[PDB]
Short mmCIF file of all heavy atoms in Angstrom, two decimals:
data_model
loop_
_atom_site.label_atom_id
_atom_site.label_comp_id
_atom_site.label_asym_id
_atom_site.label_seq_id
_atom_site.Cartn_x
_atom_site.Cartn_y
_atom_site.Cartn_z
N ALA A 75 9.30 -0.56 1.05
CA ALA A 75 8.67 -1.87 0.78
C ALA A 75 7.45 -1.72 -0.13
O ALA A 75 7.31 -2.49 -1.08
CB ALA A 75 8.25 -2.52 2.09
N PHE A 76 6.63 -0.66 0.11
CA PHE A 76 5.46 -0.28 -0.67
C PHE A 76 5.86 0.12 -2.10
O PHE A 76 5.29 -0.40 -3.06
CB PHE A 76 4.68 0.85 0.04
CG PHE A 76 3.54 1.42 -0.77
CD1 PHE A 76 2.32 0.77 -0.84
CD2 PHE A 76 3.70 2.60 -1.48
CE1 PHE A 76 1.27 1.28 -1.60
CE2 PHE A 76 2.64 3.13 -2.23
CZ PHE A 76 1.44 2.46 -2.29
N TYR A 77 6.86 1.01 -2.23
CA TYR A 77 7.39 1.48 -3.52
C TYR A 77 8.11 0.39 -4.30
O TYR A 77 7.91 0.27 -5.51
CB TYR A 77 8.25 2.72 -3.31
CG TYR A 77 7.41 3.98 -3.28
CD1 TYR A 77 7.15 4.63 -2.08
CD2 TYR A 77 6.81 4.47 -4.43
CE1 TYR A 77 6.33 5.76 -2.03
CE2 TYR A 77 5.98 5.59 -4.40
CZ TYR A 77 5.75 6.24 -3.19
OH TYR A 77 4.95 7.35 -3.15
N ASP A 78 8.87 -0.46 -3.59
CA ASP A 78 9.57 -1.60 -4.19
C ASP A 78 8.58 -2.62 -4.74
O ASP A 78 8.80 -3.14 -5.83
CB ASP A 78 10.55 -2.27 -3.21
CG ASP A 78 11.88 -1.55 -3.02
OD1 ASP A 78 12.19 -0.63 -3.82
OD2 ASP A 78 12.61 -1.92 -2.09
N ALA A 79 7.47 -2.86 -3.99
CA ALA A 79 6.38 -3.75 -4.38
C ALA A 79 5.74 -3.26 -5.67
O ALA A 79 5.49 -4.06 -6.56
CB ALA A 79 5.35 -3.81 -3.28
N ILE A 80 5.55 -1.93 -5.81
CA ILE A 80 4.96 -1.32 -7.00
C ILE A 80 5.92 -1.41 -8.19
O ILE A 80 5.53 -1.89 -9.26
CB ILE A 80 4.46 0.13 -6.72
CG1 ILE A 80 3.26 0.14 -5.77
CG2 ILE A 80 4.14 0.88 -8.03
CD1 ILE A 80 2.95 1.47 -5.18
N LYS A 81 7.15 -0.93 -8.00
CA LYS A 81 8.19 -0.92 -9.03
C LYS A 81 8.55 -2.29 -9.59
O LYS A 81 8.42 -2.49 -10.79
CB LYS A 81 9.45 -0.19 -8.53
CG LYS A 81 9.27 1.31 -8.34
CD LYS A 81 10.36 1.85 -7.42
CE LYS A 81 10.52 3.35 -7.51
NZ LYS A 81 11.79 3.80 -6.88
N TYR A 82 8.99 -3.22 -8.74
CA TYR A 82 9.50 -4.50 -9.20
C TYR A 82 8.57 -5.68 -8.99
O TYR A 82 8.88 -6.77 -9.44
CB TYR A 82 10.89 -4.76 -8.58
CG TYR A 82 11.73 -3.50 -8.47
CD1 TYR A 82 11.92 -2.87 -7.25
CD2 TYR A 82 12.32 -2.92 -9.60
CE1 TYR A 82 12.67 -1.70 -7.14
CE2 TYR A 82 13.06 -1.75 -9.51
CZ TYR A 82 13.24 -1.14 -8.27
OH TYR A 82 14.00 0.00 -8.18
N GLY A 83 7.46 -5.46 -8.31
CA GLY A 83 6.53 -6.56 -8.05
C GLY A 83 5.45 -6.73 -9.09
O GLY A 83 5.34 -5.90 -10.00
N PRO A 84 4.58 -7.78 -8.97
CA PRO A 84 3.50 -7.95 -9.95
C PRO A 84 2.43 -6.85 -9.80
O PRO A 84 2.57 -5.94 -8.98
CB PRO A 84 2.96 -9.35 -9.63
CG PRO A 84 3.23 -9.54 -8.20
CD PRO A 84 4.55 -8.86 -7.96
N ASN A 85 1.37 -6.94 -10.58
CA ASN A 85 0.31 -5.96 -10.56
C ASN A 85 -0.62 -6.20 -9.38
O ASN A 85 -1.50 -7.06 -9.46
CB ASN A 85 -0.43 -5.99 -11.88
CG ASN A 85 0.42 -5.58 -13.06
OD1 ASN A 85 1.03 -4.51 -13.10
ND2 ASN A 85 0.43 -6.43 -14.08
N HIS A 86 -0.40 -5.50 -8.26
CA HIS A 86 -1.24 -5.66 -7.08
C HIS A 86 -2.55 -4.91 -7.29
O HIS A 86 -2.55 -3.78 -7.78
CB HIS A 86 -0.52 -5.18 -5.83
CG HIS A 86 0.85 -5.76 -5.68
ND1 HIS A 86 1.97 -5.07 -6.11
CD2 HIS A 86 1.24 -6.93 -5.12
CE1 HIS A 86 3.00 -5.84 -5.81
NE2 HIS A 86 2.61 -6.97 -5.21
N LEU A 87 -3.68 -5.59 -7.01
CA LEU A 87 -5.03 -5.05 -7.15
C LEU A 87 -5.45 -4.25 -5.93
O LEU A 87 -6.19 -3.28 -6.09
CB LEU A 87 -6.04 -6.17 -7.46
CG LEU A 87 -5.86 -6.87 -8.80
CD1 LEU A 87 -6.43 -8.26 -8.76
CD2 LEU A 87 -6.45 -6.07 -9.94
N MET A 88 -4.94 -4.61 -4.73
CA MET A 88 -5.18 -3.95 -3.46
C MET A 88 -4.13 -4.25 -2.39
O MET A 88 -3.30 -5.15 -2.58
CB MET A 88 -6.64 -4.11 -2.96
CG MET A 88 -7.05 -5.51 -2.65
SD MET A 88 -8.85 -5.51 -2.45
CE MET A 88 -9.30 -6.20 -3.99
N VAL A 89 -4.14 -3.49 -1.29
CA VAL A 89 -3.19 -3.60 -0.19
C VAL A 89 -3.84 -4.33 0.98
O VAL A 89 -4.96 -3.99 1.39
CB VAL A 89 -2.62 -2.21 0.23
CG1 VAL A 89 -1.61 -2.33 1.36
CG2 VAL A 89 -2.01 -1.49 -0.96
N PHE A 90 -3.13 -5.31 1.53
CA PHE A 90 -3.57 -6.05 2.69
C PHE A 90 -2.53 -5.97 3.80
O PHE A 90 -1.42 -6.49 3.67
CB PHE A 90 -3.91 -7.51 2.35
CG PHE A 90 -4.35 -8.33 3.53
CD1 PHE A 90 -5.57 -8.08 4.15
CD2 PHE A 90 -3.55 -9.35 4.03
CE1 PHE A 90 -5.99 -8.85 5.24
CE2 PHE A 90 -3.96 -10.10 5.12
CZ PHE A 90 -5.19 -9.86 5.71
N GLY A 91 -2.91 -5.32 4.88
CA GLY A 91 -2.04 -5.15 6.03
C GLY A 91 -1.98 -3.72 6.53
O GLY A 91 -2.89 -2.93 6.30
N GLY A 92 -0.88 -3.39 7.20
CA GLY A 92 -0.69 -2.10 7.83
C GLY A 92 -0.98 -2.34 9.29
O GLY A 92 -2.12 -2.62 9.66
N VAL A 93 0.09 -2.38 10.11
CA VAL A 93 -0.06 -2.69 11.53
C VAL A 93 0.29 -1.48 12.38
O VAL A 93 -0.58 -0.99 13.11
CB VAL A 93 0.69 -3.98 11.96
CG1 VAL A 93 0.52 -4.24 13.46
CG2 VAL A 93 0.23 -5.19 11.15
N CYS A 94 1.54 -1.02 12.31
CA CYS A 94 2.02 0.12 13.09
C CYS A 94 1.35 1.37 12.63
O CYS A 94 1.11 1.52 11.44
CB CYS A 94 3.54 0.21 13.06
SG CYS A 94 4.34 -1.39 13.31
N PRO A 95 0.86 2.18 13.58
CA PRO A 95 0.04 3.35 13.23
C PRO A 95 0.62 4.34 12.21
O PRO A 95 -0.02 4.68 11.21
CB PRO A 95 -0.27 3.99 14.59
CG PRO A 95 0.76 3.41 15.54
CD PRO A 95 0.96 2.03 15.05
N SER A 96 1.86 4.79 12.48
CA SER A 96 2.57 5.75 11.65
C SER A 96 2.86 5.23 10.25
O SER A 96 2.72 5.99 9.29
CB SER A 96 3.87 6.16 12.33
OG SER A 96 4.72 5.03 12.44
N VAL A 97 3.25 3.94 10.14
CA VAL A 97 3.54 3.26 8.88
C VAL A 97 2.28 3.17 8.03
O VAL A 97 2.34 3.41 6.82
CB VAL A 97 4.12 1.85 9.13
CG1 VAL A 97 4.44 1.13 7.82
CG2 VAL A 97 5.37 1.92 10.00
N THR A 98 1.13 2.80 8.66
CA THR A 98 -0.18 2.65 8.00
C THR A 98 -0.69 4.00 7.49
O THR A 98 -1.13 4.07 6.34
CB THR A 98 -1.22 1.97 8.91
OG1 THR A 98 -0.64 0.91 9.66
CG2 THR A 98 -2.40 1.44 8.14
N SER A 99 -0.58 5.06 8.32
CA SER A 99 -0.97 6.42 7.97
C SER A 99 -0.23 7.00 6.73
O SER A 99 -0.86 7.69 5.93
CB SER A 99 -0.83 7.34 9.19
OG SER A 99 -1.10 8.69 8.85
N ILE A 100 1.09 6.75 6.60
CA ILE A 100 1.91 7.24 5.48
C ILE A 100 1.49 6.53 4.17
O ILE A 100 1.31 7.19 3.13
CB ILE A 100 3.45 7.12 5.77
CG1 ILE A 100 3.87 8.00 6.97
CG2 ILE A 100 4.30 7.47 4.53
CD1 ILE A 100 5.28 7.76 7.47
N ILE A 101 1.35 5.19 4.24
CA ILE A 101 0.96 4.33 3.12
C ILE A 101 -0.46 4.66 2.70
O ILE A 101 -0.69 4.97 1.53
CB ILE A 101 1.17 2.82 3.43
CG1 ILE A 101 2.66 2.47 3.43
CG2 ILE A 101 0.40 1.92 2.43
CD1 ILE A 101 3.02 1.29 4.26
N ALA A 102 -1.40 4.65 3.66
CA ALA A 102 -2.80 4.93 3.38
C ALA A 102 -3.05 6.29 2.75
O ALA A 102 -3.94 6.42 1.90
CB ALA A 102 -3.65 4.73 4.62
N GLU A 103 -2.24 7.28 3.10
CA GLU A 103 -2.33 8.62 2.55
C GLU A 103 -2.15 8.63 1.02
O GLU A 103 -2.82 9.40 0.34
CB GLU A 103 -1.28 9.49 3.24
CG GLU A 103 -1.34 10.96 2.87
CD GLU A 103 -0.41 11.85 3.66
OE1 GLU A 103 0.60 11.34 4.20
OE2 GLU A 103 -0.69 13.06 3.74
N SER A 104 -1.27 7.76 0.48
CA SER A 104 -0.93 7.70 -0.94
C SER A 104 -1.65 6.64 -1.81
O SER A 104 -1.28 6.44 -2.97
CB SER A 104 0.58 7.59 -1.10
OG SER A 104 1.09 6.40 -0.53
N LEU A 105 -2.70 6.01 -1.28
CA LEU A 105 -3.44 4.97 -1.99
C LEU A 105 -4.27 5.42 -3.21
O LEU A 105 -4.22 4.73 -4.23
CB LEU A 105 -4.35 4.19 -1.05
CG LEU A 105 -3.72 3.42 0.06
CD1 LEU A 105 -4.77 3.06 1.05
CD2 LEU A 105 -2.97 2.18 -0.46
N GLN A 106 -5.07 6.51 -3.08
CA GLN A 106 -5.93 7.03 -4.16
C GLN A 106 -5.14 7.40 -5.42
O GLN A 106 -5.63 7.15 -6.53
CB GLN A 106 -6.78 8.20 -3.66
CG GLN A 106 -7.86 8.62 -4.64
CD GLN A 106 -8.60 9.89 -4.26
OE1 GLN A 106 -8.58 10.34 -3.11
NE2 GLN A 106 -9.30 10.46 -5.23
N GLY A 107 -3.93 7.94 -5.24
CA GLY A 107 -3.03 8.27 -6.34
C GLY A 107 -2.58 7.03 -7.09
O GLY A 107 -2.28 7.10 -8.28
N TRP A 108 -2.58 5.88 -6.40
CA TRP A 108 -2.17 4.60 -6.95
C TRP A 108 -3.31 3.66 -7.37
O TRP A 108 -3.03 2.61 -7.94
CB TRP A 108 -1.24 3.90 -5.98
CG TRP A 108 0.12 4.51 -5.96
CD1 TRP A 108 0.65 5.33 -5.00
CD2 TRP A 108 1.10 4.44 -7.00
NE1 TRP A 108 1.91 5.73 -5.36
CE2 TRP A 108 2.21 5.20 -6.59
CE3 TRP A 108 1.16 3.77 -8.24
CZ2 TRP A 108 3.37 5.31 -7.37
CZ3 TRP A 108 2.30 3.88 -9.01
CH2 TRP A 108 3.39 4.64 -8.57
N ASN A 109 -4.60 4.03 -7.09
CA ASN A 109 -5.82 3.24 -7.38
C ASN A 109 -5.86 1.94 -6.58
O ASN A 109 -6.39 0.92 -7.05
CB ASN A 109 -6.02 3.00 -8.90
CG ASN A 109 -6.09 4.26 -9.74
OD1 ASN A 109 -5.33 4.44 -10.69
ND2 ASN A 109 -6.98 5.18 -9.39
N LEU A 110 -5.32 2.00 -5.35
CA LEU A 110 -5.17 0.86 -4.46
C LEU A 110 -6.01 0.94 -3.19
O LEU A 110 -5.71 1.72 -2.29
CB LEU A 110 -3.68 0.65 -4.12
CG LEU A 110 -2.78 0.09 -5.23
CD1 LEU A 110 -1.32 0.18 -4.85
CD2 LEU A 110 -3.14 -1.35 -5.56
N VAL A 111 -7.02 0.08 -3.10
CA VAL A 111 -7.87 -0.01 -1.91
C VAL A 111 -7.07 -0.79 -0.85
O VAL A 111 -6.39 -1.75 -1.20
CB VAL A 111 -9.24 -0.68 -2.22
CG1 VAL A 111 -10.07 -0.90 -0.95
CG2 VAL A 111 -10.02 0.15 -3.23
N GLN A 112 -7.07 -0.32 0.40
CA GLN A 112 -6.35 -1.00 1.48
C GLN A 112 -7.29 -1.59 2.53
O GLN A 112 -8.26 -0.94 2.91
CB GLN A 112 -5.30 -0.09 2.13
CG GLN A 112 -4.59 -0.72 3.33
CD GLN A 112 -3.46 0.10 3.91
OE1 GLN A 112 -3.06 1.16 3.39
NE2 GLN A 112 -2.88 -0.39 4.99
N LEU A 113 -6.97 -2.82 2.98
CA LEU A 113 -7.68 -3.49 4.06
C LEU A 113 -6.69 -3.95 5.13
O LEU A 113 -5.83 -4.79 4.86
CB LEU A 113 -8.55 -4.64 3.56
CG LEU A 113 -9.38 -5.37 4.60
CD1 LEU A 113 -10.53 -4.52 5.12
CD2 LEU A 113 -9.93 -6.61 4.03
N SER A 114 -6.80 -3.36 6.33
CA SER A 114 -5.99 -3.62 7.51
C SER A 114 -6.80 -4.45 8.50
O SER A 114 -8.01 -4.25 8.67
CB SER A 114 -5.57 -2.31 8.17
OG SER A 114 -4.77 -2.52 9.32
N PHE A 115 -6.12 -5.37 9.18
CA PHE A 115 -6.72 -6.25 10.18
C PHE A 115 -6.18 -5.93 11.58
O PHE A 115 -6.61 -6.56 12.55
CB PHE A 115 -6.44 -7.73 9.83
CG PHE A 115 -4.97 -8.02 9.60
CD1 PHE A 115 -4.11 -8.23 10.67
CD2 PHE A 115 -4.44 -7.99 8.32
CE1 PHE A 115 -2.74 -8.41 10.45
CE2 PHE A 115 -3.07 -8.20 8.10
CZ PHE A 115 -2.23 -8.41 9.17
N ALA A 116 -5.20 -4.99 11.70
CA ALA A 116 -4.60 -4.70 13.00
C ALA A 116 -4.43 -3.24 13.36
O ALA A 116 -4.26 -2.96 14.54
CB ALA A 116 -3.28 -5.45 13.16
#
């Protein structure tokens, strides 16, 4: 979903979300390489 959003989606300035611990940890690990600041509420 993260990779599909990057590939075929518009130019996202930052990431909003990440709920499940393991899912958030994998995504968050690869943010700096993508220049994407992430903000989670859960």
Side-chain angles (χ1 to χ4, degrees):
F76 173 81
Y77 275 105
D78 282 347
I80 292 165
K81 291 161 162 194
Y82 323 104
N85 296 305
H86 310 95
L87 295 155
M88 64 192 103
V89 181
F90 179 68
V93 179
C94 315
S96 64
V97 180
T98 320
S99 175
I100 297 169
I101 288 154
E103 186 174 23
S104 63
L105 298 165
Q106 190 187 342
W108 286 104
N109 303 124
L110 288 169
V111 174
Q112 176 174 354
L113 183 71
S114 180
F115 52 82

